Amino acid sequence: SKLEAILSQEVEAEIQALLQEAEAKAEAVKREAEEKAKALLQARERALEAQYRAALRRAESA
Amino acid sequence: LIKSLAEKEKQLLERLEAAKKEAEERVKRAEAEAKALLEEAEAKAKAL
Amino acid sequence: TRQKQELEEELALAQAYLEPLERLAALAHGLDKSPFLRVIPFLLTEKELPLVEEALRKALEDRYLLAHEAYAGGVAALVVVHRKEVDQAKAALSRAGVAELRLPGALGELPLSEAARRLKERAEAAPRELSEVRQHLAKLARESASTLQSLWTRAQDEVARLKALEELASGRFGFALLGYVPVKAKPKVEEALARHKESVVYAFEPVDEHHEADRIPVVLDNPPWAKPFELLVSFLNTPKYGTFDPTPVVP
Numbered sequence A: 001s002k003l004e005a006i007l008s009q010e011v012e013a014e015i016q017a018l019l020q021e022a023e024a025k026a027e028a029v030k031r032e033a034e035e036k037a038k039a040l041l042q043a044r045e046r047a048l049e050a051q052y053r054a055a056l057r058r059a060e061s062a
Numbered sequence B: 001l002i003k004s005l006a007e008k009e010k011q012l013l014e015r016l017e018a019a020k021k022e023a024e025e026r027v028k029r030a031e032a033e034a035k036a037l038l039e040e041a042e043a044k045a046k047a048l
Numbered sequence C: 001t002r003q004k005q006e007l008e009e010e011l012a013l014a015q016a017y018l019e020p021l022e023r024l025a026a027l028a029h030g031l032d033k034s035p036f037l038r039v040i041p042f043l044l045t046e047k048e049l050p051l052v053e054e055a056l057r058k059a060l061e062d063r064y065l066l067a068h069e070a071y072a073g074g075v076a077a078l079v080v081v082h083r084k085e086v087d088q089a090k091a092a093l094s095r096a097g098v099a100e101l102r103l104p105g106a107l108g109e110l111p112l113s114e115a116a117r118r119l120k121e122r123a124e125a126a127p128r129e130l131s132e133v134r135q136h137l138a139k140l141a142r143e144s145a146s147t148l149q150s151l152w153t154r155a156q157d158e159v160a161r162l163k164a165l166e167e168l169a170s171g172r173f174g175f176a177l178l179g180y181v182p183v184k185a186k187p188k189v190e191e192a193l194a195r196h197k198e199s200v201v202y203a204f205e206p207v208d209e210h211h212e213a214d215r216i217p218v219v220l221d222n223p224p225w226a227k228p229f230e231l232l233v234s235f236l237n238t239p240k241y242g243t244f245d246p247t248p249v250v251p
Helices: A002-037 A040-061 B002-047 C003-015 C019-027 C049-058 C084-095 C112-142 C145-164 C183-192 C227-233
Strands: C039-044 C075-080
Touching: A002 A040, A002 B002, A040 B002, C003 C112, C019 C039, C019 C075, C019 C112, C039 C049, C039 C084, C049 C075, C049 C084, C075 C084
Parallel strands: none
Antiparallel strands: C039 C075
């Protein structure tokens, strides 16, 4: 029937909105985890490089 | 005609269960991907 | 009498509306309480279904399932579209004349499937309790009525004695009362009042005469050949103790 198909289309629209919101939030989660793997890979690399440099400065001073 | 409404309510509950399992599938693949990224970062950091 | 009278209320409201409710339950077994479309029920009159379905024609005509299938004692006009659509179409149908099944008890306060099951339960249970409560009230009559009306006689005696006890006069060391006794009752009262403490003092006054005599009680005291016409002469009023005894002339 007509309103039968209308209610079925409303259920399909709810499922569509649910899956689109799931895609958006999963993309945001993997994005922020990618930036935290990023910028953490920045911070510890710069810290260890500076530790290596300070060790070389102290060795040549000694 | 009563069986039409019964089958429609049944298959709409089936579609809602399928959408719920799809959302849970999104969540568990995202958790597995975050775990894989943490493992890659830890392995690269240890070798580095 | 709480239980059975409220049982008769529930049984009378059940038996008149078992089959339309079970019919709409078998008709609505694809939507018991589904959260998209209310089921406007109307047990209505004979074949004037287009007059109430004009509101559904004003509603969705290629949709919005509304009809009356069977049980032609009252046409079960069910309407089902949506929430607000069925509400507004029910308002228009009530403007054309319609009413929803909102009754007391459990049928018009719950969903129709389980309420029809509860009505089947009460229809299959209640005459057994009808018979058993009649049997227990019969037993309660046959082995309680004697002692309860005996204590009723006792209670009427006690209430009569205490309400007549205020017709006395006393202060602090004694009372006095006055009464009227017919003259053929003097030995019975005399032997009854001979029992008490030191045969406490009676005054058997010959009554004051016809002057200032309206408060005197009256009896008839006729010989037993003329006795049974006292009711036939006492449909009317009573004499004044000094008016002639009218009763022998009617025999």
